[PDB]
Amino acid sequence: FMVSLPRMVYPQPKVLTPCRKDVLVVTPWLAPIVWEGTFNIDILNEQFRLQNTTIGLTVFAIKKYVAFLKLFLETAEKHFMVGHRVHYYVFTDQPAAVPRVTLGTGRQLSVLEVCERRFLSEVDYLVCVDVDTEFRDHVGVEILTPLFGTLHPSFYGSSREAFTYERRPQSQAYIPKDEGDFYYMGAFFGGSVQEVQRLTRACHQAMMVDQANGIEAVWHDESHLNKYLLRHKPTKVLSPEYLWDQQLLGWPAVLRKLRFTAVP
Numbered sequence: 147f148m149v150s151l152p153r154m155v156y157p158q159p160k161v162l163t164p165c166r167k168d169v170l171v172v173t174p175w176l177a178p179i180v181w182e183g184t185f186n187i188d189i190l191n192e193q194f195r196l197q198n199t200t201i202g203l204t205v206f207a208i209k210k211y212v213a214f215l216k217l218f219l220e221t222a223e224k225h226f227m228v229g230h231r232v233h234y235y236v237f238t239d240q241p242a243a244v245p246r247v248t249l250g251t252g253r254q255l256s257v258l259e260v261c262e263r264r265f266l267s268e269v270d271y272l273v274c275v276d277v278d279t280e281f282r283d284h285v286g287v288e289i290l291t292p293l294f295g296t297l298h299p300s301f302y303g304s305s306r307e308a309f310t311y312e313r314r315p316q317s318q319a320y321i322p323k324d325e326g327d328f329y330y331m332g333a334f335f336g337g338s339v340q341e342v343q344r345l346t347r348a349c350h351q352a353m354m355v356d357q358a359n360g361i362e363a364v365w366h367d368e369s370h371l372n373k374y375l376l377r378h379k380p381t382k383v384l385s386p387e388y389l390w391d392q393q394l395l396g397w398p399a400v401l402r403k404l405r406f407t408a409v410p
């Protein structure tokens with residue numbers, strides 16, 4: 147059950163003015179593609195806060211990657227889901243090396259040394275990112291939906307034939323040259339707990355089949371994510387605002403905000 151929104155004063159949507167004339171803002175299966183200028187964050191914040199939404203943020207930090215945690219978490223505190231309940235899950239081989247970062251109210255961190263059902267009772271949504279990154283701008287409830295992938299910054303303007311999908315038919319990740327919507331990046335996906343567990347279960351089984359068959363997909367996890375998201379369309383797609391690489395790719399006019407980035 148969803149309670150009424152309160153009175154709010156904001157600009158009227160303009161039916162005869164497009165959000166963007168430079169980019170696609172809806173997929174052919176009518177999922178929004180999230181770019182700056184498409185959403186009113188006040189509206190979305192109200193909707194998600196009224197549902198007392200909790201977001202889980204999962205990172206795997208093994209060996210030398212533990213060194214990235216301090217910047218990752220400090221910047222998450224500044225930019226990720228601020229105002230909402232957040233639960234960080236840091237999966238590491240070095241629990242004592244996790245930095246002691248100060249968290250805002252309503253935000254908590256669990257260190258798990260390297261199950262599943264723990265997530266279903268603790269959070270509403272799971273967001274799965276790489277830890278060698280930092281937040282630079284708002285990443286909020288506008289991303290939340292049953293299942294989302296993010297447009298890989300090197301491929302968003304590419305034709306499908308140029309996508310680095312797995313191309314050998316012997317791999318469970320195979321996608322032929324006449325298939326594919328987008329090239330999603332392995333480093334930033336998420337959704338409801340139930341849908342993220344579906345995805346990771348599917349990719350885990352496909353990867354075991356490939357291993358039994360003597361084949362390893364070209365981009366590993368990412369190749370299988372792309373196969374999954376081809377066959378199970380995401381309910382939102384995030385623009386490359388959401389995982390950019392300024393060193394490799396600069397700051398093109400199409401990007402109004404650079405929200406989350408690879409550390410150089």
Ligand SMILES: [Hg+2]
Binds near residue numbers: 164166183185
């Ligand atoms: Hg708009």
Ligand SMILES: [Hg+2]
Binds near residue numbers: 272273
């Ligand atoms: Hg995850």
Ligand SMILES: [Hg+2]
Binds near residue numbers: 349350352370371374
């Ligand atoms: Hg998969």
Ligand SMILES: [Hg+2]
Binds near residue numbers: 353
């Ligand atoms: Hg996997």
Ligand SMILES: [Hg+2]
Binds near residue numbers: 345346350367368374
């Ligand atoms: Hg996957």
